[PDB]
Amino acid sequence: KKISGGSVVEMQGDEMTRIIWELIKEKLIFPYVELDLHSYDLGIENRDATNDQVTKDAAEAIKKHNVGVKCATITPDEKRVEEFKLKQMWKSPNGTIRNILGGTVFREAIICKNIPRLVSGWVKPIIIGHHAYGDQYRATDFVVPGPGKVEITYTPSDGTQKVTYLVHNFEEGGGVAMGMYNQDKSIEDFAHSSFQMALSKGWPLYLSTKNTILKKYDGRFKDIFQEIYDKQYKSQFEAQKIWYEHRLIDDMVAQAMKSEGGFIWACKNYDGDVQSDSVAQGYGSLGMMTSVLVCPDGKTVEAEAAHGTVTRHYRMYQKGQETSTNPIASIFAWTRGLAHRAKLDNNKELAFFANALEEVSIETIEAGFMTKDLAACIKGLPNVQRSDYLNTFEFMDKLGENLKIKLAQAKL
Amino acid sequence: KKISGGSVVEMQGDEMTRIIWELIKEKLIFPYVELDLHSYDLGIENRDATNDQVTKDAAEAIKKHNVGVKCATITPDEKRVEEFKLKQMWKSPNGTIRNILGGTVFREAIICKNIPRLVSGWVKPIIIGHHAYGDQYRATDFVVPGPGKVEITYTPSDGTQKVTYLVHNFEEGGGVAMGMYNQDKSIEDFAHSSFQMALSKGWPLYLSTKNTILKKYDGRFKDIFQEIYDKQYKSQFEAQKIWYEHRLIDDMVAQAMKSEGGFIWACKNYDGDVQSDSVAQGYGSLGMMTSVLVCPDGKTVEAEAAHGTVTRHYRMYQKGQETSTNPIASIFAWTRGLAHRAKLDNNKELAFFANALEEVSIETIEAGFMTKDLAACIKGLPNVQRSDYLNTFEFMDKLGENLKIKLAQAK
Ligand SMILES: NC(=O)C1=CN([C@@H]2O[C@H](COP(=O)(O)OP(=O)(O)OC[C@H]3O[C@@H](n4cnc5c(N)ncnc54)[C@H](OP(=O)(O)O)[C@@H]3O)[C@@H](O)[C@H]2O)C=CC1
Ligand SMILES: NC(=O)C1=CN([C@@H]2O[C@H](COP(=O)(O)OP(=O)(O)OC[C@H]3O[C@@H](n4cnc5c(N)ncnc54)[C@H](OP(=O)(O)O)[C@@H]3O)[C@@H](O)[C@H]2O)C=CC1
Ligand SMILES: C[C@@H](Nc1nc(N[C@H](C)C(F)(F)F)nc(-c2cccc(Cl)n2)n1)C(F)(F)F
Ligand SMILES: [Mg+2]
Ligand SMILES: [Mg+2]
C-alpha cells in the first residue's frame, strides 16, 4: 500500500526543529511512503561525539544518492560551547555540507492566499540563489594607521612579469583597506546551478551585479553567465517560454518591489546574504521559507528549512509551556527532496505524493488552521488570541487528518 | 506684502525641470517672498559656454551664503555631446558641487495619505544619507588570467615594517580580484553630517555595516561613529529624546520594511546607492523625492530634487503633446532651502511660508488633485484615465491658487 520511496539521505537536527522533524516523519511521511533511508544524527551532541565526522559522512552520502533531507542544526558559538561542553567549536553543518557538495542554495517562501504580506503585490514566488563563495566573505581587510601607500599586486606563477596597482596613497591620516577575490570556477558553477534551477522551476532568471562601477570584477560574473546561457541553456529557455537577463542591483531591487514575483534572482554573496532575510521578511514568517541546495550537475539536491532551530520556542518547550511552531518549511524540505527523488527515478507515485503534501499544507492554512506566527500576520501581533491559532502538536494533527483525507479522495 | 527672504543662491537647470523651475518661482515663491538672489545658469548650454566655470561659481557662492537651490541638470555622456556638440564631456554638476562643498546628501520622499506604497507600513519618512566617497567607487578591479598569487600590501611613508596580505593563490584557472579603500576623514565628515541631520530633523539615526563579516574595515566606520557621538552629540540626542544605533545591514533592511518610518538611515556608499532608488520607489513616484546636501559644519545646505531632468517627458512637450510632470520634489527643494535660510536667519515669516508651501502641496494631492504618476499609484498603471490627473500646467496653477488662499487666511 505504501509508495516505494527510493534512496534518500536523512539528517537529524537540533532543538525545536528536531521535535517537529520526528513528528513530520512519523505522521506525514512514513505511513504513506517507504524509503531506503540513510540516517545521520546531526544533533549537536552527536556531532560533538563524532568530532563532526558524522556531518562529513552525511555529506558524502548525499553525493552517492543525490538526495538529502536535512533538519536545522545548532551552529556552534562560544555560548553553545559552554552550553554543551563541546570538545571544539565545530564548523556549521551547512557550511561543511555545502563545501563538500559544491552547488548553490536557493531560498523560496511558501505563499498562502489568506496570509498578508509586507509587500502585498508579491503573489508569486521570488526565489533567491546565493553565491556563497564570497568576494566579501573571504576577504583580506585591515585598518590603515597612518600615511602609507596601499598596492595590489598579481604575480603570475608562470614567471611572467608581476603587475602592481596603487589602490591608494594616504598622504595624510588613517584609512581602511581591503583585498578580495573571486574564482572563475565558482561563478561558473553558480551560473550552471541557476540556469538549471530556473529550467526546473519554470521561472525566468535574473543575475544582479554592479558591473557599471566595477567593469572588470563584475564583468566576469556577467560575462560567464552570458557565455554559458548562450552555449548551453538558451534554447531550453526558449522552449519553456522563459528567459535569462542581467540586471543592475539598483534596478533589480526596485524592480522586485514593483514586481508580482515569479522569478529566480541570482545573487552575489553579499547581495544574497542581505536578500535572503529581506525577501523572507517581505513574504511573511520565517516558518514559511525553505532552502534547497542544488549542484551544477543537476542530479544532486539537499533540502532544508531556511529558518533555524527556533531556540526561543524550544526554551518554552523545556519550561513545559505551550508552543506554536511552524513546520511548513521543515515539511517542505521533505517534499522538495521527495520531488527531486521522484524526478531522478521517474517515479510518478512519489511525485504525486510530494505534491499532495504541499497542497494539503497550504489548503489547511488557507482554511484557517495555522500556527501562531501565521495568525499574527492576518490579525496583527497585538490582536492575536489563543482561539486564533493551533499549537504545534495541534497543527500537525490537523495536517495529518487532512493528508489522510486527501490521499483517499485521490484514490478513485 | 513680501517676506524678506535673505540671501539665496539659485541655479537654473535643464529640460523639463527647467520649465517647472520657472513656474515655481513665478507662481509660488516670488509673489510672496523677496530675496537677495544670486543666480547661476547651470543649464547645459551655458555650462558648455563657460567650460563649466559657472558650475564652480555656484559652488563657491553656496559656501559664501550657506544656502543653494538647484534645478536638475543634464549630466553629459557620449550621446549628450553629439546632441549639444559640447567642447568637452563635462563632469556632473552635483559631483563638482559636492566635491567643493563636501557634505552628505540626504534623500527624503514626501508622503501623501491618499497615495499607496509598496510597503504598507510606512507612514513616516525614512531619510537615506549616502556616503559618496566610495570604497567600491574608487577601487582597482582586475581580471585574473591564470594561476597567480594576488596580494595586497600596505607600506608606511617611512617605509618600515610594511604588511603583506595574500588575498588568494590561484592554483588553477583564473578569477577576478579587487582592492578598495576608505579614508578616516571622509568617514568622519559623513558621521558629523548624519548626526547634525538627525538633531536638525528630530529623528533617530541608524548606521549600517557588515562589521561582523569585515571587522576591521567596517568596524572603523562603526568605531568612528560611536566615538564622535559619544564625545560630541550623545548629550544633545538624549535631551531631544533621540538616539543613534548601529545595525547590521541585513537587519536594517528587514527592520525597515517592518517599520513605519520615522528614522534617518546612514548608508555606506554601495548600500546607499541601492537604497536611494528602492526607497523612493517603495514610497511612491520619483517626483516625490528631494535631495538635500548638508555639510559637516551644518551651516551649509544645498537643496534639489532627487530626480533628473525628466527628458522623456520633455521630448513629448517638445512634440506638442500632453505632459504630467510632478513638481513636488522640485517645489520642496525650494521650501527646504528656505527653511534652512529661516533657521540661519531666525526668520519666523520665512519659516512660516516654507511650511505653508509644503502644507499646501500635500493638501492639494490629498484632495485628489495630482499628476499622472500619483494617479497611477492609486489606480494601478493601466487603469489611469485622463480625468484622474492634472496636466503639468494644470497642477501648477492649482497649486498657485491654493497657495494664495492658504496664505490669505494667515492674514
Ligand atoms: N538551517 C539552519 O541550519 C540554520 C540554523 N540556525 C541555528 O538556529 C539556532 C537559533 O536560531 P535563531 O538565530 O534564533 O533563528 P531561528 O531561525 O531559530 O528563528 C528565530 C525566530 O524566528 C522566528 N521563527 C523562525 N522559525 C520559526 C518557525 N518554524 N515557527 C515560528 N517562528 C519561527 C521566531 O520568532 P519569534 O522570536 O517571534 O518567536 C523565532 O523566535 C542557532 O544555533 C543557529 O545556529 C540558524 C540559521 C539557519
Ligand atoms: N539631480 C540631478 O541633477 C539629476 C539629473 N539627472 C539627469 O536627468 C537626465 C535624464 O534622467 P533620467 O535618467 O531620464 O531620469 P529622470 O530622473 O529624469 O526620470 C526618469 C524617469 O523617472 C520618472 N520621473 C522622474 N521624475 C519625474 C516627475 N517629476 N514626474 C513624473 N515622473 C518622473 C519618469 O518615468 P516615466 O518614464 O514613467 O514617466 C522618467 O521617465 C539625465 O541627463 C540625467 O543625467 C539624473 C539624475 C539626477
Ligand atoms: C527599500 C528596501 N531596501 C532594500 N531592499 C532590498 N530588497 C528587498 C527584499 C526587495 F527587493 F524585495 F525590495 N534590498 C536592499 C539592499 C540594501 C543594501 C544592499 C543590498 Cl545588495 N540590498 N535594500 C527597504 F529598506 F525598505 F527594505
Ligand atoms: Mg512556474
Ligand atoms: Mg517550568
mmCIF file of C-alpha atoms in Angstrom, chain B residues 87-252:
data_model
loop_
_atom_site.group_PDB
_atom_site.id
_atom_site.type_symbol
_atom_site.label_atom_id
_atom_site.label_comp_id
_atom_site.label_asym_id
_atom_site.label_seq_id
_atom_site.Cartn_x
_atom_site.Cartn_y
_atom_site.Cartn_z
ATOM 1 C CA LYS B 87 33.527 71.040 -26.413
ATOM 2 C CA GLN B 88 34.244 68.667 -23.546
ATOM 3 C CA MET B 89 32.400 65.856 -21.827
ATOM 4 C CA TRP B 90 31.710 67.811 -18.678
ATOM 5 C CA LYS B 91 31.637 66.210 -15.247
ATOM 6 C CA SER B 92 28.359 66.205 -13.318
ATOM 7 C CA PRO B 93 27.401 69.439 -11.539
ATOM 8 C CA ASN B 94 26.351 67.643 -8.383
ATOM 9 C CA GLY B 95 29.731 65.973 -8.323
ATOM 10 C CA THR B 96 31.531 69.243 -8.900
ATOM 11 C CA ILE B 97 29.363 70.977 -6.333
ATOM 12 C CA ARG B 98 29.638 68.092 -3.934
ATOM 13 C CA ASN B 99 33.397 67.979 -4.184
ATOM 14 C CA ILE B 100 33.746 71.699 -3.468
ATOM 15 C CA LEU B 101 31.210 71.788 -0.625
ATOM 16 C CA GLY B 102 31.950 68.488 0.980
ATOM 17 C CA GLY B 103 28.859 67.160 2.712
ATOM 18 C CA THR B 104 26.490 64.222 2.537
ATOM 19 C CA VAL B 105 23.265 64.091 0.533
ATOM 20 C CA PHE B 106 20.088 63.041 2.304
ATOM 21 C CA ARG B 107 17.086 61.779 0.362
ATOM 22 C CA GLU B 108 13.569 62.320 1.663
ATOM 23 C CA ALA B 109 10.342 61.480 -0.116
ATOM 24 C CA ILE B 110 7.189 63.471 0.535
ATOM 25 C CA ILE B 111 4.313 61.438 1.921
ATOM 26 C CA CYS B 112 0.678 61.853 0.964
ATOM 27 C CA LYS B 113 -2.028 59.965 2.809
ATOM 28 C CA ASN B 114 -4.004 59.087 -0.315
ATOM 29 C CA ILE B 115 -1.068 57.574 -2.206
ATOM 30 C CA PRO B 116 -0.399 53.856 -1.746
ATOM 31 C CA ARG B 117 3.079 52.460 -1.210
ATOM 32 C CA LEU B 118 4.708 49.126 -1.869
ATOM 33 C CA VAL B 119 5.323 48.750 1.836
ATOM 34 C CA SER B 120 2.068 49.096 3.727
ATOM 35 C CA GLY B 121 3.609 50.201 6.992
ATOM 36 C CA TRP B 122 5.470 53.381 6.219
ATOM 37 C CA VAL B 123 3.526 56.415 7.360
ATOM 38 C CA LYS B 124 6.605 58.365 8.330
ATOM 39 C CA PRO B 125 9.594 59.497 6.306
ATOM 40 C CA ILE B 126 12.714 57.384 6.059
ATOM 41 C CA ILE B 127 15.696 59.521 5.144
ATOM 42 C CA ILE B 128 18.706 57.985 3.474
ATOM 43 C CA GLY B 129 22.107 59.521 3.965
ATOM 44 C CA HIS B 130 24.653 58.395 1.455
ATOM 45 C CA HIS B 131 28.424 58.289 1.740
ATOM 46 C CA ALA B 132 29.605 59.481 -1.665
ATOM 47 C CA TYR B 133 33.284 58.852 -1.175
ATOM 48 C CA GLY B 134 33.494 55.274 -2.190
ATOM 49 C CA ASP B 135 35.389 52.162 -1.320
ATOM 50 C CA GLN B 136 33.701 50.486 -4.281
ATOM 51 C CA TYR B 137 33.649 53.569 -6.444
ATOM 52 C CA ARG B 138 37.368 54.193 -6.204
ATOM 53 C CA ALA B 139 38.613 50.645 -6.480
ATOM 54 C CA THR B 140 41.063 48.761 -8.605
ATOM 55 C CA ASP B 141 39.491 45.662 -10.037
ATOM 56 C CA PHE B 142 41.200 43.385 -12.499
ATOM 57 C CA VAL B 143 40.537 40.062 -14.173
ATOM 58 C CA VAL B 144 42.920 37.262 -13.239
ATOM 59 C CA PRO B 145 44.076 35.384 -16.334
ATOM 60 C CA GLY B 146 45.813 32.349 -14.912
ATOM 61 C CA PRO B 147 47.259 30.820 -11.789
ATOM 62 C CA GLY B 148 48.951 33.537 -9.839
ATOM 63 C CA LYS B 149 49.287 34.983 -6.383
ATOM 64 C CA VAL B 150 47.295 38.101 -5.599
ATOM 65 C CA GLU B 151 48.494 40.230 -2.705
ATOM 66 C CA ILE B 152 47.512 43.456 -1.016
ATOM 67 C CA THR B 153 50.306 45.352 0.716
ATOM 68 C CA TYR B 154 50.497 48.436 2.879
ATOM 69 C CA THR B 155 53.719 50.409 3.053
ATOM 70 C CA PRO B 156 54.229 53.216 5.564
ATOM 71 C CA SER B 157 55.706 56.508 4.409
ATOM 72 C CA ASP B 158 58.882 55.830 6.356
ATOM 73 C CA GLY B 159 58.910 52.504 4.521
ATOM 74 C CA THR B 160 59.471 50.477 7.646
ATOM 75 C CA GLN B 161 57.504 47.388 8.700
ATOM 76 C CA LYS B 162 55.245 47.023 5.673
ATOM 77 C CA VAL B 163 52.456 44.432 5.766
ATOM 78 C CA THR B 164 51.549 41.938 3.045
ATOM 79 C CA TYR B 165 48.227 40.106 2.927
ATOM 80 C CA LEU B 166 47.731 37.277 0.470
ATOM 81 C CA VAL B 167 44.239 37.537 -0.949
ATOM 82 C CA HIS B 168 44.386 34.302 -2.904
ATOM 83 C CA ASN B 169 46.664 31.954 -4.754
ATOM 84 C CA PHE B 170 45.131 30.653 -7.942
ATOM 85 C CA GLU B 171 46.371 27.094 -8.279
ATOM 86 C CA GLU B 172 44.362 26.507 -11.413
ATOM 87 C CA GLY B 173 42.398 28.785 -13.670
ATOM 88 C CA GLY B 174 41.516 32.436 -13.456
ATOM 89 C CA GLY B 175 39.400 34.832 -11.443
ATOM 90 C CA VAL B 176 38.698 38.447 -10.663
ATOM 91 C CA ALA B 177 40.446 40.308 -7.854
ATOM 92 C CA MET B 178 39.935 43.798 -6.468
ATOM 93 C CA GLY B 179 41.324 46.219 -3.898
ATOM 94 C CA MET B 180 39.432 49.060 -2.211
ATOM 95 C CA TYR B 181 39.990 51.749 0.399
ATOM 96 C CA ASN B 182 38.341 54.419 2.518
ATOM 97 C CA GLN B 183 39.528 57.475 4.390
ATOM 98 C CA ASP B 184 39.264 58.204 8.090
ATOM 99 C CA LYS B 185 38.455 61.833 7.338
ATOM 100 C CA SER B 186 35.729 61.091 4.814
ATOM 101 C CA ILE B 187 34.018 58.799 7.271
ATOM 102 C CA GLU B 188 34.368 61.394 9.996
ATOM 103 C CA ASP B 189 32.659 64.074 7.926
ATOM 104 C CA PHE B 190 29.928 61.665 6.924
ATOM 105 C CA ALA B 191 29.244 60.871 10.573
ATOM 106 C CA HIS B 192 29.097 64.528 11.556
ATOM 107 C CA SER B 193 26.513 65.463 8.932
ATOM 108 C CA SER B 194 24.347 62.486 9.768
ATOM 109 C CA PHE B 195 24.360 63.368 13.456
ATOM 110 C CA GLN B 196 23.599 67.004 12.722
ATOM 111 C CA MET B 197 20.852 65.964 10.337
ATOM 112 C CA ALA B 198 19.267 63.759 12.971
ATOM 113 C CA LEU B 199 19.396 66.532 15.539
ATOM 114 C CA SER B 200 18.089 69.026 12.997
ATOM 115 C CA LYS B 201 15.190 66.904 11.780
ATOM 116 C CA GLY B 202 14.355 65.362 15.157
ATOM 117 C CA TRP B 203 14.697 61.720 14.113
ATOM 118 C CA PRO B 204 16.757 58.786 15.377
ATOM 119 C CA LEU B 205 19.821 57.803 13.347
ATOM 120 C CA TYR B 206 20.967 54.364 12.246
ATOM 121 C CA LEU B 207 24.275 53.412 10.665
ATOM 122 C CA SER B 208 24.535 50.056 8.928
ATOM 123 C CA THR B 209 27.668 47.991 8.389
ATOM 124 C CA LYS B 210 28.725 44.420 7.676
ATOM 125 C CA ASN B 211 31.151 44.657 10.549
ATOM 126 C CA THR B 212 30.575 41.075 11.563
ATOM 127 C CA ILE B 213 31.941 39.940 8.198
ATOM 128 C CA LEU B 214 34.588 42.622 7.763
ATOM 129 C CA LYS B 215 35.517 43.520 11.279
ATOM 130 C CA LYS B 216 38.470 45.794 10.634
ATOM 131 C CA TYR B 217 37.118 47.614 7.601
ATOM 132 C CA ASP B 218 33.511 48.013 8.682
ATOM 133 C CA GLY B 219 34.330 48.462 12.335
ATOM 134 C CA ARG B 220 36.220 51.668 11.692
ATOM 135 C CA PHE B 221 33.050 53.047 10.239
ATOM 136 C CA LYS B 222 31.318 51.703 13.281
ATOM 137 C CA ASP B 223 34.029 52.889 15.669
ATOM 138 C CA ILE B 224 34.312 56.403 14.285
ATOM 139 C CA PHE B 225 30.578 56.930 14.562
ATOM 140 C CA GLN B 226 30.387 55.898 18.196
ATOM 141 C CA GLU B 227 33.457 57.879 19.117
ATOM 142 C CA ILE B 228 32.208 61.087 17.544
ATOM 143 C CA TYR B 229 28.769 60.527 19.007
ATOM 144 C CA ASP B 230 29.948 59.653 22.489
ATOM 145 C CA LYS B 231 32.277 62.634 22.539
ATOM 146 C CA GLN B 232 30.106 65.246 20.814
ATOM 147 C CA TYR B 233 26.478 64.502 20.055
ATOM 148 C CA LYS B 234 25.227 61.990 22.584
ATOM 149 C CA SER B 235 24.248 64.566 25.157
ATOM 150 C CA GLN B 236 22.192 66.509 22.630
ATOM 151 C CA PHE B 237 20.360 63.405 21.402
ATOM 152 C CA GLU B 238 19.262 62.390 24.885
ATOM 153 C CA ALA B 239 17.909 65.860 25.519
ATOM 154 C CA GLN B 240 15.822 65.581 22.373
ATOM 155 C CA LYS B 241 14.536 62.073 23.112
ATOM 156 C CA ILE B 242 16.587 60.855 20.171
ATOM 157 C CA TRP B 243 19.095 58.032 19.749
ATOM 158 C CA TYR B 244 21.749 56.673 17.409
ATOM 159 C CA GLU B 245 22.227 52.956 16.915
ATOM 160 C CA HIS B 246 24.228 50.742 14.572
ATOM 161 C CA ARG B 247 22.735 47.836 12.686
ATOM 162 C CA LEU B 248 23.978 45.007 10.532
ATOM 163 C CA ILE B 249 22.756 45.698 7.040
ATOM 164 C CA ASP B 250 20.506 42.636 6.725
ATOM 165 C CA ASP B 251 18.859 43.572 9.982
ATOM 166 C CA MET B 252 18.377 47.154 8.887
#
